[PDB]
Design a protein around this ligand. Structure first.
Ligand SMILES: CCCCCCCCCCCCCCCCCC(=O)OC[C@H](COP(=O)([O-])OCC(O)COP(=O)([O-])OC[C@@H](COC(=O)CCCCCCCCCCCCCCCCC)OC(=O)CCCCCCCCCCCCCCCCC)OC(=O)CCCCCCCCCCCCCCCCC
Ligand SMILES: CCCCCCCCCCCCCCCCCC(=O)OC[C@H](COP(=O)([O-])OCC(O)COP(=O)([O-])OC[C@@H](COC(=O)CCCCCCCCCCCCCCCCC)OC(=O)CCCCCCCCCCCCCCCCC)OC(=O)CCCCCCCCCCCCCCCCC
Ligand SMILES: CCCCC/C=C/C/C=C/C/C=C\C/C=C\CCCC(=O)O[C@H](COC(=O)CCCCCCCCCCCCCCCCC)COP(=O)(O)O[C@@H]1[C@H](O)[C@H](O)[C@@H](O)[C@H](O)[C@H]1O
Ligand SMILES: CCCCC/C=C/C/C=C\CCCCCCCC(=O)O[C@H](COC(=O)CCCCCCCCCCCCCCC)COP(=O)([O-])OCC[N+](C)(C)C
Ligand SMILES: CCCCCCCCCCCCCCCCCC(=O)OC[C@H](COP(=O)(O)OCCN)OC(=O)CCCCCCCCCCCCCCCCC
Lengths: 64, 164, 76, 114, 216, 89, 276, 469
């Protein structure tokens, strides 16, 4: 589902932000606005990839 | 204007009808949607905005200092460049019949209808010998596939556009 | 005494500054950029007004695009 | 045919070079008076001399610029045959080269002692 | 495991051994027409560790037997040139040391630590002056490896880093422009890895204190 | 082709053996390129085809650029600039 | 400063034409460095003494200049001069390295942040007898290089008794700064309160104002000015009108970041304010 | 988009101060980011494995070239971010990672050469692109010439690459002499069956593969990687390999080659065993790259290997960037610096890193496990695709060699983790300086990609099936 893909991408962005905070030796809740930015960006990338996947399936089905 | 070699007729590069296999630069710019100009402006504002955002994220010398006007102007010029390249590629894939090109197809139809009514040649007449026309078409054929690498546009009125 | 006013601050002021303070570079750019620009902006004008371009010269024999006709004369 | 000549010639001159190079194994062990150079003394009192980077850059850059110029010779021999397409290609070629010429001028890399 | 051995030291000029002197050679200006003399002794007394002795005279008088020379008066010793015949290493590896420590009693003379390493040129030398702080008493003067200054023919040059992976010889020499006898008693020369930060003078030298540490 | 191939063989084996004679190794590079160009030109003449000669001139230009870069490398390596910067900032 | 270039040409004619006393070299080196703005001529003036001694036979330079000229280089963070002067020292056949050169050479490397050279100069000072060797100037540089490392600042403090030294007023001040800039506001007060008992060195204005300046808690800043009113009443009152006290602290909703990261930014800003 | 960048950089860098280098590199970083995010729609040209020929049959364009092209831009963005953005805002890190005035221009010219290698359709274009990449990479290696350790590596790399390029040109000219052609379009099944041009292609593959350094010509590039600056080594050890291997995969000239198979087995054995004998980080990573190159060379023996090669090269590029960036970040937690160019040398200097940055050690553990092939990380899946491909074609001995090589390499991979999870009582001389947020974010993104890229395995498989068939 599109919603599930967006949720997964946003969670991956949150995980990336958390890992960046922990690498810098900083608390987990350091820059929550950065959490929002990372989640939005990774969710957008996930949306683009999901759209590519949907177009791929459409192209696969159309030649039948 | 007589072609010297055989070319594919109405070849389908995608799910849409072919308009022009090797559209001219003036042709591509003339068939440009307003959305492509929006993309051009988007990039032209995005590189300076990207520079400012990168400066905010990690200042070069520790203290936040906005980049000088020289960097903003270079970024603006390069943004216009990348936006123009993206717009040209989008218009080209519209010509190639890859994306939606219904309005472009209708405008193309009306255009050569008017040109035939005026008693002209279908894709122009050139200053170049027919051998040079063939060489130009063979060099510029599908050159938009290398937009990531180099810029190259069709500035030759050659008849090798893959149409009837 | 003399300091560069900057090209972007003023185009014509910088043009005069380059013409008066850096003659060699200014003239190098002038003749260099005149060529392509004058070509682009004058070749259509020359074609329209002065004289049309000459007909292409032959590169080999012009082969007729037709079948072999039956000819009579100079037979064995 | 070139591969064949290469492969069979390798062993013969290879062995010849091998033998002539096992010869120097011991020779002129350069027992010369290398004592003042393993300490750090100088005996010239003169012959300092200098070479600005711009001098060696003139010498080296004579070569790529000469190649750039000599690449124009094929164009002038077929100027009429490739008139407009070739004219544009040569213009782009010259502009690309002038980008590097502008680099070497702005950097002031070629200005000898001032 | 079976990896190349890693160590925090490597003795270069050991001395203190019956052979010792076979590891090093000497070169005075007698190679030129000069009159300086060099000779390396071996002292093994009691109540102490046996050391080497590096003495001689450094007469700076020019060689009035030839003319193309301009300045003379040197005397040096160095490790034997590294034997690279067909299969062995080729040279020394100093990529994990960053220092060289040598224990010596000094005098008023100004000695140089001379290092020969891989270099495109032939007579390039990495040399750093041996700063003798305490004359007449032993001192473990440490010289950082990446502070030697490249010299060819005795002239400071473009300071490119030493090739620590390929080092040939290490030695001490006199290029001091002064007359008179000289002496220098060395008992080891080694390259020592990075020491951790310490905040005591030394264990070999100490000053009166409360001695908080428990006695053994 | 005989002359080009044999020049290439001799220069290649001169490179392999010395390998520490940077002047002579770079000379051997130049001579190997010359030997390859000779073979290419001979085959282009035999086949009466222009691609061989075009690749030959391309190899000439590339060889020139490579020689310039390599001689800059040798300048940096041997410190040809000199120093005499003593008693200076 | 504007005419600093002009002083260079006039210096050249003074030496080409007239023989210049050697003692005048000290004044020119101090002038062409510690006086107005320019330090390039300080090195060249030192290089002038070297060139004449080697070639002409003029009397050689002494180690006093290199010790002084390192100190002047450690003020403008002049990375080029330190490298240039070091290799001149490393191949000198007239003067040698001693306690004073290493101290200022170590301070020159702290300014340019060279973790290797700083430890290198500390090894050479350490391996020397305490008679001539590690002094209060050595500790002064060593503490200033551990300004943001509380662990190595402390072990440096216990180093002073081992070398046979008694801390000085300039020695105490940096120790108070280092404790303050790492969040140890409370421990700093006990050091200042009990320093006069332990050593007999009465706290000065440059000590007390330092503790107030580098305390970045609005309440901890108050406890600093609790003993001062009733133990040093007269000598505080001359700091209120001198604008020495500065009230820089940490932000309010700043618990998002590390407290230790705040102390770095607060102290870095405070270092500039005390630089002039 | 790249030619214009090169021209604009020459013009702008010509008229800029040295202090503008970071800003220029940042500008190109965002420029390339926008090139990827804005011109990415060009993948619509390659539905159903549609192929185009460009510039008079001198260039080829398909989905494979497009994907390698995008991967090269992503790698270039990461590496240029490593140069534009300052890891730590202090003078020491200023000195260690300071870009040269021409470094970004050389980087872009080398990217151009690599792309022209990937897109080549003719031997003249192939040779010209090879020479462009080679000269650019020589200049990249030599641009830091203040040390003899770097100088010897630069000179060795110049001479060895000159010999290799001469051999490549000789093979190409022999092919031309045989066929009077400079393109592969003249090669068909009948052409291969009737005439014996196999040796020419074997020599060409030999010359090309030696440029990336397979056995028994591995030692010179390993020395070069050891001696070049690490911010240079991270680039010179990935991009040329990607270009050469992509050209070899797309060329498809080594089907079931005995010589190629034997050399791949030798490369795997040498990389696995020689890694056990390494105490330096750079040499260990060089042998790791050798082992990965052997793994990818095993894919040259069979057809329909596009998916496995693409997946493995992408995951290896990500892991390579991640491991070098981890090594770069760990520089802050050591008490001394070896060289201005290579600040860390021996694996022993990473000892006890878990007591300075535990999450850095966690990221390194993830990347090392992906190198070993522990599921569900990307490295395991790439190795699994390689195993499936080689077992589909019946290379059983090759599979056994692959498994044994992986098992051996796991030992010296776990060497790193075992050293790093030790105890270092020596406390740091540095504290509390904050690491760059941009570079930390990029490293974390690489680690998260390695950790959770297996989510999109089916999606990637479907996209490959629709865009490559
Ligand atoms: C010849 C044939 C024609 C082609 C070449 C034309 C060149 C014209 C040059 C004119 C200016 C010459 C000059 O004095 O420049 C400064 C310099 C010498 O003067 P100076 O004052 O001593 O410079 C020292 C400065 O103080 C110190 O430097 P600075 O701080 O002043 O900065 C210098 C800076 C600035 O230098 C310049 O300004 C010189 C170059 C100007 C190029 C202008 C291109 C503008 C493109 C964008 C336009 C639209 C913008 C967006 C608008 C909104 C859209 C929604 O240099 C650059 O960064 C180079 C330009 C960067 C790329 C610009 C081009 C992008 C690609 C465009 C593609 C074309 C698209 C066509 C679309 C068609 C649609 C149908 O000369 C050059 O830089 C040489 C020329 C460089 C060409 C590039
Ligand atoms: O009005 C003419 C025409 C307007 O429409 P038209 O009257 O129907 O004529 C169309 C055909 O030109 C009519 O057919 P045609 O055969 O007469 O056109 C062929 C064309 C010449 O044949 C060509 O098409 C030559 C183009 C060759 C390839 C162009 C690809 C661009 C590649 C960009 C460079 C990056 C390379 C990558 C490096 C790796 O003939 C010409 O005489 C055009 C040359 C005009 C002036 C010379 C060039 C202007 C300055 C050059 C740069 C601009 C500053 O537009 C042009 O003048 C086009 C030429 C501009 C080329 C821009 C170079 C980029
Ligand atoms: C297809 C699959 C391929 C690749 C997938 C990779 C990435 C996914 C795509 C895009 C990733 C881009 C995401 C943008 C959102 C990221 C984001 O919050 O900003 C930054 C870093 O920002 C990049 O450094 C942004 C880097 C952009 C490029 C990343 C490419 C890797 C992280 O905040 P942060 O807390 O450090 O933010 C700053 C804060 O803004 C400052 O005020 C503070 O002074 C500073 O200390 C710090 O708090
Ligand atoms: C807003 C525009 C930004 C786009 C910039 C993209 C740069 C790509 C760069 C570096 C590679 C990073 C991973 C790319 C993923 C493969 C896409 C694909 O699907 O791979 C296929 C081919 O699969 C293959 O053979 C094997 C691919 C091996 C991938 C190995 C990594 C696995 C983990 C990555 C999972 C992604 C996580 C995203 C989280 C939100 C190419 O697809 P395609 O040629 O049909 O075009 C795609 C449409 N595109 C251009 C819009 C994207
Ligand atoms: C094609 C050109 C071929 C020759 C190339 C010569 C290379 C010179 C490159 C160069 O350095 O030029 C920039 C130069 C630098 O300026 P400067 O102040 O010297 O900078 C010192 C740096 N620290 O800048 C200059 O000082 C020169 C800038 C002069 C620009 C004005 C001339 C441009 C031509 C415009 C008029 C053309 C004629 C009329 C056209 C009308 C229609 C448009």
């Amino acid at each position: 589902a599109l919603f599930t893909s967006l949720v997964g991408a946003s969670g991956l962005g949150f995980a990336t932000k958390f890992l960046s905070n922990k690498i810098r030796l900083k608390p987990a809740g350091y820059y929550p606005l950065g959490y929002v930015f990372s989640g939005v960006a990774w969710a957008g990338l996930g949306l683009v990839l999901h759209n590519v996947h949907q177009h791929s399936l459409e192209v696969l089905e159309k030649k039948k | 204007s007589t072609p010297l070699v055989k070319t594919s007729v109405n070849y389908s590069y995608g799910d849409y009808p072919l308009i022009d296999a090797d559209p001219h630069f003036k042709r591509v710019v003339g068939y440009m949607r307003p959305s492509d100009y929006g993309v051009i402006g988007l990039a032209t504002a995005a590189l300076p905005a990207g520079i400012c955002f990168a400066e905010w994220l990690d200042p070069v010398k520790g203290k936040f200092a906005r980049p000088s006007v020289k960097f903003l102007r270079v970024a603006t010029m390069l943004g216009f460049a990348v936006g123009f390249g993206a717009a040209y590629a989008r218009s080209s894939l519209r010509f190639f019949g890859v994306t939606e090109n219904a309005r472009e197809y209708k405008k193309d139809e009306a255009q050569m209808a008017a040109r035939k009514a005026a008693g002209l040649e279908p894709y122009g007449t050139s200053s170049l010998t027919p051998e040079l026309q063939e060489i130009a078409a063979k060099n510029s054929a599908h050159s938009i596939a290398g937009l990531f690498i180099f810029p190259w546009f069709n500035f030759v009125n050659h008849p090798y556009h893959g149409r009837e | 005494i003399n300091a560069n006013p900057g090209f972007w601050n003023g185009p014509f002021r910088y043009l005069r500054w380059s013409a008066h303070n850096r003659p060699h570079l200014f003239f190098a750019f002038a003749i260099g950029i005149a060529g392509p620009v004058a070509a682009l902006t004058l070749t259509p004008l020359r074609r329209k007004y002065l004289y049309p371009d000459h007909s292409p010269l032959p590169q080999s024999y012009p082969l007729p695009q037709r079948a072999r006709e039956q000819l009579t004369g100079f037979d064995d | 045919n070139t591969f064949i000549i290469f492969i069979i010639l390798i062993p013969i001159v290879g062995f010849a070079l091998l033998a002539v190079n096992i010869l120097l194994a011991v020779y002129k062990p350069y027992n010369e008076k290398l004592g003042a150079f393993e300490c750090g003394l100088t005996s010239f009192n003169q012959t300092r001399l200098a070479f600005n980077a711009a001098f060696i850059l003139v010498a080296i850059l004579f070569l790529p610029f000469d190649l750039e110029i000599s690449t124009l010779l094929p164009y002038v021999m077929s100027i009429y045959l490739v008139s407009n397409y070739g004219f544009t290609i040569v213009l782009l070629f010259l502009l690309i080269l002038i980008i590097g010429f502008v680099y070497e001028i702005n950097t002031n890399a070629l200005k000898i002692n001032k | 495991r079976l990896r190349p051995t890693e160590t925090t030291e490597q003795v270069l000029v050991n001395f203190t051994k019956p052979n010792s002197l076979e590891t090093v050679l000497t070169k005075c200006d007698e190679e030129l027409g000069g009159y300086s003399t060099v000779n390396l002794a071996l002292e093994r007394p009691t109540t102490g560790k046996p050391y080497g002795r590096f003495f001689g005279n450094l007469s700076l008088d020019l060689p009035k037997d030839n003319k193309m020379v301009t300045r003379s008066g040197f005397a040096m010793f160095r490790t034997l040139d590294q034997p690279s015949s067909m299969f062995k290493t080729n040279a020394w590896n100093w990529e994990q040391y960053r220092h060289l420590e040598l224990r010596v009693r000094g005098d008023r003379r100004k000695y140089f630590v001379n290092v020969q390493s891989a270099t495109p040129l032939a007579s390039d030398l990495y040399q750093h002056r041996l700063f003798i702080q305490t004359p007449g008493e032993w001192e473990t003067v440490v010289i950082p490896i990446d502070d030697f200054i490249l010299t060819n023919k005795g002239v400071v040059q473009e300071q490119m880093a030493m090739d620590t992976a390929n080092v040939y010889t290490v030695g001490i020499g006199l290029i001091d422009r002064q007359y008179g006898p000289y002496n220098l008693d060395i008992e080891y020369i080694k390259a020592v890895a990075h020491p951790p930060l310490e905040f005591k003078p030394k264990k070999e030298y100490e000053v009166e204190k409360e001695t908080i540490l428990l006695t053994p | 082709m005989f002359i080009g191939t044999i020049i290439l063989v001799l220069s290649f084996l001169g490179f392999v053996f010395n390998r520490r004679n940077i002047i002579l190794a770079f000379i051997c590079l130049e001579t190997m390129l010359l030997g390859i160009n000779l073979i290419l030109l001979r085959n282009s003449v035999l086949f009466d085809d222009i691609s061989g000669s075009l690749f030959a001139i391309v190899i000439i230009i590339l060889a020139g650029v490579e020689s310039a870069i390599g001689l800059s490398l040798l300048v940096s390596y041997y410190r040809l600039r000199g120093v005499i910067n003593s008693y200076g900032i | 400063s504007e005419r600093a270039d002009l002083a260079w040409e006039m210096y050249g004619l003074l030496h080409k034409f007239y023989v210049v006393p050697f003692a005048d070299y000290y004044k020119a080196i101090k002038f062409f460095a510690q006086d107005v703005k320019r330090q390039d001529y300080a090195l060249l003036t030192f290089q002038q003494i070297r060139k004449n001694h080697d070639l002409h036979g003029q009397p050689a330079a002494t180690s006093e200049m290199v010790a002084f000229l390192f100190h002047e280089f450690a003020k403008t963070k002049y990375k080029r001069g330190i490298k240039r002067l070091h290799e001149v020292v490393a191949l000198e056949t007239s003067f040698d390295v001693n306690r004073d050169v290493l101290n200022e050479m170590m301070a020159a490397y702290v300014s340019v942040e060279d973790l290797n050279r700083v430890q290198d100069c500390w090894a050479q000072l350490q391996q020397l007898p305490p008679s001539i060797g590690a002094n209060n100037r050595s500790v002064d540089v060593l503490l200033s290089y551990f300004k943001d490392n509380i662990h190595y600042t402390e072990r440096t403090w216990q180093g002073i008794p081992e070398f046979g030294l008694l801390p000085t007023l300039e020695n105490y001040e940096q120790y108070l700064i280092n404790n303050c800039r790492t969040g140890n506001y409370r421990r700093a007060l006990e050091i200042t309160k009990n320093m006069e008992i332990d050593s007999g060195l009465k706290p000065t204005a440059k000590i007390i104002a330092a503790v107030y300046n580098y305390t970045f808690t609005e309440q901890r800043k108050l406890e600093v000015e609790q003993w001062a009113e009733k133990a040093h009443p007269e000598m505080w009152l001359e700091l209120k009108e001198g604008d020495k006290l500065k009230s820089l602290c940490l932000p309010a909703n700043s618990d998002n970041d590390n407290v230790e990261s705040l102390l770095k930014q607060a102290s870095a800003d405070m270092d500039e304010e005390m630089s002039g | 988009m790249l030619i214009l960048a090169i021209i604009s950089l020459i013009t702008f860098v010509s008229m800029s101060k040295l202090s503008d280098n970071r800003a220029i590199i940042r500008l190109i970083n965002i420029y390339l980011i926008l090139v990827l995010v804005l011109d990415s729609f060009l993948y619509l040209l390659f539905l159903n494995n549609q192929t185009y020929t460009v510039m008079g049959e001198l260039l080829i364009f398909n989905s494979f070239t497009f994907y390698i092209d995008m991967l090269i831009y992503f790698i270039m963005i990461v590496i240029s971010s490593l140069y534009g953005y300052n890891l730590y805002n202090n003078n020491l890190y200023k000195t260690l990672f300071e870009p040269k005035k021409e470094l970004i221009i050389l980087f872009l010219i080398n990217i151009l050469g690599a792309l022209l290698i990937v897109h080549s359709n003719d031997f003249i274009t192939l040779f010209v692109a090879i020479e462009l990449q080679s000269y650019s990479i020589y200049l990249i290696t030599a641009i830091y010439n203040s040390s003899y350790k770097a100088s010897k590596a630069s000179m060795l790399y110049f001479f060895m690459g000159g010999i290799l390029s001469i051999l490549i040109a000789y093979s190409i000219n022999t092919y031309y002499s045989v066929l009077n052609s400079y393109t592969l379009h003249s090669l068909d099944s009948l052409i291969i069956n009737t005439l014996d041009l196999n040796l020419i292609l074997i020599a060409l593959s030999l010359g090309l593969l030696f440029k990336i350094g397979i056995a028994p010509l591995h030692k010179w590039l390993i020395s070069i990687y050891e001696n070049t600056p690490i911010l240079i080594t991270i680039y010179i050890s990935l991009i040329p390999k990607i270009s050469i291997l992509s050209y070899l995969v797309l060329s498809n000239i080594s089907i079931n080659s005995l010589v190629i198979s034997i050399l791949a087995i030798l490369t795997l054995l040498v990389g696995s065993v020689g890694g056990l004998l390494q105490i330096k980080i750079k040499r260990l990573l060089a042998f790791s790259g050798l082992t990965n190159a052997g793994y990818m060379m095993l894919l040259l023996l069979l057809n329909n290997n596009e998916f496995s090669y693409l997946y493995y090269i992408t995951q290896y590029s990500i892991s390579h960037l991640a491991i070098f960036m981890i090594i770069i970040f760990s520089i802050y937690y050591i008490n001394y610096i070896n060289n201005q160019y290579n600040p860390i040398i021996y694996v022993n200097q990473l000892k006890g890193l878990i007591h300075d940055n535990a999450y850095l050690v966690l990221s390194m553990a993830i990347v090392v496990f992906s190198f070993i092939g522990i599921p569900p990380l990307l490295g395991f899946f790439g190795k699994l695709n390689i195993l499936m491909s080689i077992l589909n074609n019946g290379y059983y001995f090759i599979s056994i060699v692959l498994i044994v090589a992986s098992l051996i390499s796991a030992l010296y991979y776990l060497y790193l983790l075992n050293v790093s999870i030790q105890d270092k009582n020596n406390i740091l001389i540095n504290s509390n300086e904050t690491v760059s947020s941009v570079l930390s974010y990029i490293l974390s993104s690489l680690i998260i990609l390695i950790t959770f890229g297996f989510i999109y395995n089916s999606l990637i498989i479907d996209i490959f099936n629709v865009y490559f068939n």
